[PDB]
């Protein structure tokens, strides 16, 4: 369940994003194989600006990419970047929130009150205590 969820939370958000862009277009009720196709092209597109804008900045001896590394990355994918300020200011756009994240409130595990035999001198104090 959780390992599937690690991948699925991030894929299901991608699918909801795809469904929302399809609705904005005009499509209501799409074919099932056409949604897992388009959300596979969406994940492969975010993963390709990840690998190529990291490659363009590290070619210039840097470690984190600026704006000038993505506007050359999107050019090498044929994007025509200038049309993006008009796309961002739509009136039809939706917003999908981030998925729910399991988080320990104070500590991941407060373990359990156990104390017992002292450490021999070949075990330092920072190793866990001897239990029952």
């Amino acid at each position: 369940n959780p390992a599937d969820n690690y991948h699925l939370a991030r894929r299901r958000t991608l699918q909801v994003v795809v469904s929302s862009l399809l609705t904005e277009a005009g499509f209501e009720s799409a074919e099932k194989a056409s949604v897992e196709t388009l959300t596979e092209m969406l994940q492969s597109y975010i993963s390709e600006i990840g690998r190529s804008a990291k490659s363009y900045c590290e070619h210039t001896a840097r470690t984190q990419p600026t704006l000038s590394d993505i506007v050359v990355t999107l050019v090498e994918m044929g994007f025509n970047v200038d049309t993006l300020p008009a796309y961002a200011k739509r009136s039809q756009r939706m917003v999908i929130t981030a998925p729910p994240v399991t988080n320990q409130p104070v500590t991941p595990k407060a373990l359990t009150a156990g104390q017992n035999r002292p450490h021999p001198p070949h075990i330092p104090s920072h190793f866990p205590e001897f239990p029952d």
Partner: protein, 90 residues
């Protein structure tokens, strides 16, 4: 600097894809979240690609609106040079 101005406006803008999900697939490829606005521009670029494919597919559906079928994605991605595949094995 039109795009530098746009990225500077991208703070206070929430994109359709969350930054916890766009940033996850960027961290998978080595791109680390130094600046949120850069993650948001990458998210908007991916959105524009999927949206343009969808709009071309809708023009094809209107010509033949409503349901999106694999026979609408097939001529829509053919001008992009992408040959989409039917499942055919399930």
């Amino acid at each position: 600097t039109p795009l530098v101005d746009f990225l500077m406006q991208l703070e206070d803008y929430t994109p359709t894809i969350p930054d916890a999900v766009t940033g996850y697939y960027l961290n998978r490829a080595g791109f680390e979240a130094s600046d949120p606005r850069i993650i948001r521009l990458i998210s908007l670029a991916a959105q524009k690609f999927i949206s343009d494919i969808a709009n071309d597919a809708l023009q094809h559906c209107k010509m033949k609106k409503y349901t999106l079928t694999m026979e609408d994605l097939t001529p829509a991605l053919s001008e992009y040079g992408i040959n989409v595949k039917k499942p055919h094995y399930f």
